[PDB]
Amino acid sequence: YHVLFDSYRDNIAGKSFQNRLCLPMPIDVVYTWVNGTDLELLKELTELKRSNEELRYSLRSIERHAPWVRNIFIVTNGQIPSWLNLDNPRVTIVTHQDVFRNLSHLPTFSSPAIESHIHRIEGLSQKFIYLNDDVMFGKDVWPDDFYSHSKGQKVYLTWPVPNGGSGGDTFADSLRYVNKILNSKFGFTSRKVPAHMPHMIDRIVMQELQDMFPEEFDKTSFHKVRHSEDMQFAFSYFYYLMSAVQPLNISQVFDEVDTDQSGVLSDREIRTLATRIHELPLSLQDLTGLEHMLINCSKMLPATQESYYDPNLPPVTKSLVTNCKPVTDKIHKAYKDKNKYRFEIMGEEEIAFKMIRTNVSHVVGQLDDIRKNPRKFVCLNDNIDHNHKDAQTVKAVLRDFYESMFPIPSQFELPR
Amino acid sequence: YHVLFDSYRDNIAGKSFQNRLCLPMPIDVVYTWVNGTDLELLKELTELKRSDNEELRYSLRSIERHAPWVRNIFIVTNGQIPSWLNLDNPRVTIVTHQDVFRNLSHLPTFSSPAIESHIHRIEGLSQKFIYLNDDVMFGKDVWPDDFYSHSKGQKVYLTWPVPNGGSGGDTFADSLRYVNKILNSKFGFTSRKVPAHMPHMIDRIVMQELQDMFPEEFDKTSFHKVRHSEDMQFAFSYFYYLMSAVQPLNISQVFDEVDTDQSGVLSDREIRTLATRIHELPLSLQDLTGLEHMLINCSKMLPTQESYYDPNLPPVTKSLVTNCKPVTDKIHKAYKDKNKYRFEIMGEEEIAFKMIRTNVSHVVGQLDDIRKNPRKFVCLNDNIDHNHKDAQTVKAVLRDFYESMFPIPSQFELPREYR
Ligand SMILES: *[C@@H]1O[C@H](CO)[C@@H](O)[C@H](O)[C@H]1NC(C)=O
Ligand SMILES: *[C@@H]1O[C@H](CO)[C@@H](O)[C@H](O)[C@H]1NC(C)=O
Ligand SMILES: *[C@@H]1O[C@H](CO)[C@@H](O)[C@H](O)[C@H]1NC(C)=O
Ligand SMILES: *[C@@H]1O[C@H](CO)[C@@H](O)[C@H](O)[C@H]1NC(C)=O
């Protein structure tokens, strides 16, 4: 009963470090589902005139390989579930009326507009995982695969934007436009496309991005069809995480310098302050000049006897160091800008970006590649020519692979 | 309240994953300290004729300030204790050799490796602990993640490979070559590196398995009361046993990973999965036909949802796949023996290694660089000649550095004789 509390309270400090040892919990999952049959196609056709079965196996992968998620949300245009189980209260369907701030955009018919407003679902945990109904987990995946406290959120990158793009691509042009925006805002940098995977997102960082970039997100959500200059959901979040700048708070610098927590620096702490300010090697002249500028600032600005080197040195405090312009400028010049969030970068180590080209000889090869080498993230986008004699056979073998991977029943299905 | 209990078990699976998501806790700290007292000097003089910096008090402050999540601190010493130490504090325990060595004939150990090889056998010790050599201290902020991670196992720190040149070395390279030859005879030959001198995370189970796998060498190194070429080092042996331990393959594990249905019988899909796991791409119909031929032959030589492409196939259960010699041989050839313990390797990114050569400007530069760029682990080797007139100056400089880095008295000390 009290053993759980006492175990984390049993250290030399007597504190509790659950926020640093047990990861952030709980974690939710957000999917997306669209049905291209009958009414939706009719709406698209009339809009043009005026102007498969992957989700089940994805949820089965959620049950099998990632059993640490709390809730599953599926965003729909009002399409009621066809095989989901609503008796279990751990899965719910959220209509776009909730995510949209304005009801005039409910005929979405576009993916970035849906993806931009995910973080406004009520009941969502602090961090949530986003899957686009063509990805799944093929190996045991744990939250430390996405986020570790010491090295921050984990970012997976892939081919660079200019190299992997091509002319005449609607999606490539949007990524280039987002690149232009971020290079004109945070400065020029080499950018790499995030991997197509079940990304992990944080509500706080995304909301900060919303507040920082309201007009552009509103503009890209305004479009009713996928446009050439939309903003990607994963790339924006990840690169804002990378390039988030934090102001240099001098008070924390002094707090870390002043180990006594007494607010006054002894003769030994000026050594640490000067060495953090200065660059190697360090001569006595620089330290004497630091002491001289300190006394000059104390004398020019009107204002337990610790012994110092120079008796002309008055005791130094926060009210002195923070209001001393030369030392603050020297600290700012010395201390580089530090990122507000931490991150770790890797590549395509365990990501199965498999492409279906409507050639069963190659489809079976790709599936065998997946089967021999199990991977944590699998991408199986359904690209079929549908005008080929053996096109149904590709779907048949793909569904055979799906059945092979996850044949066990899941509780999120009606026992028909 | 029900919410407090359900918070850790609120999930789809309904199971508590605390043993995996909450890191290995608790963790203890062990120290090896010795003092140059009159009795120790007299016993050393007697042994040879027959045949202090007080860095502990500052490492304790470093543990208190930078590593507040440790549980207990154990120190092993030759019966002597500092006067300032707070023995009345029920969180630091002095440990004598009467409960460390298996035999009482080595109590005049007088050699660090003998104590090191047995430091893991103290009663009440946590399954994982951090080894402190009384000269290394912490910095920045240290968490169990800096030593161990569940997804990647432990983290081993390697500085630079052993030279193997020979024709030199007094008492350090010889022990490295000794352990190197032992591990070459046991696990094979490879280019090995010397672990960094730093606080090391040690497992009691792995250490016990190491001691039960090389028992003769370890009672030999416990035999030597003076450090010699014939001793087996602590960090080198532990880390390379962890990095080179292997386990024989168990057919049940692969049989269960290929049995996605968890039914005990393999359909065509599972047979294809096994075939593509064991064989190389591009898999063709010939390999599957040969596998089915081998299956039917091994069946002839001796429960719902049943369907097969070939009617000759009996239900492929654990019995039929476990006892088939040639396909088990091909399975072993495909999936070799892997390491039993996970590990992670990295270099010299965040380790501080400083030496004092009595050249005052360079030791001052070293400590100034430590101050400028704090690092997680600091190692200050003291080998001052003590005949240079600046020995007291170096002592004062090191005292100044230690006091500046940790001026606050620790919970393990009695504040006495102020200033
Ligand atoms: C700087 O850190 C101090 C620490 O005492 C804190 O009180 C203060 O709010 C911080 N300032 C800013 C602008 O964040
Ligand atoms: C599939 O690719 C192979 C590559 O060797 C080619 O020979 C074959 O014609 C392709 N099949 C189809 C149906 O395009
Ligand atoms: C090895 O396989 C056997 C098969 O009977 C199983 O019972 C046992 O638990 C396995 N042992 C290990 C150590 O994996
Ligand atoms: C002492 O150290 C300095 C580096 O700070 C070096 O230049 C000098 O040559 C060294 N030796 C002597 C004898 O001064």
Residue numbers in the entry:
A (entry chain A): 6 to 56, 89 to 340, 351 to 463
B (entry chain B): 6 to 56, 88 to 338, 350 to 466
Provide the publication's sentences verbatim.
Replacing S1 (233 aa) with a 29 aa linker sequence corresponding to the S1 region of the Dictyostelium discoideum PTase and deleting a large region from Notch 1 (N1) to the S1P cleavage site allowed for shortening of hPTase by 680 aa. The structure of soluble S1S3 was determined by single-particle cryo-EM at an overall resolution of 3.4 Å. Both 2D class averages and 3D maps show that S1S3 dimerizes similarly to PTase and has quite similar structural features as the catalytic core of PTase. This finding explains why mutations within the EF-hand cause disease and inactivate the protein. S1S3 superimposes well on hPTase and zebrafish PTase (zPTase) with an RMSD of 0.63 and 0.75, respectively. S1S3 has essentially the same catalytic pocket with the catalytic NDD motif in the same orientation as other PTase structures. Thus, S1S3 is likely locked in a constitutively active open state, consistent with its kinetic parameters.
PTase is the key enzyme of the mannose 6-phosphate (M6P) targeting system that is responsible for tagging lysosomal hydrolases with the M6P moiety for their delivery to the lysosome. First, GlcNAc-1-phosphotransferase (PTase) transfers GlcNAc-1-phosphate (GlcNAc-1-P) from UDP-GlcNAc to mannose residues on the high mannose glycans of the hydrolases, following which the GlcNAc moiety is removed by uncovering enzyme to generate the M6P monoester. PTase is an α2β2γ2 heterohexamer encoded by two genes, GNPTAB and GNPTG. The α and β subunits are transcribed and translated from the GNPTAB gene as a precursor molecule that is cleaved by site-1 protease (S1P) at Lys-928 to generate the individual subunits, a critical step for the activation of the molecule.
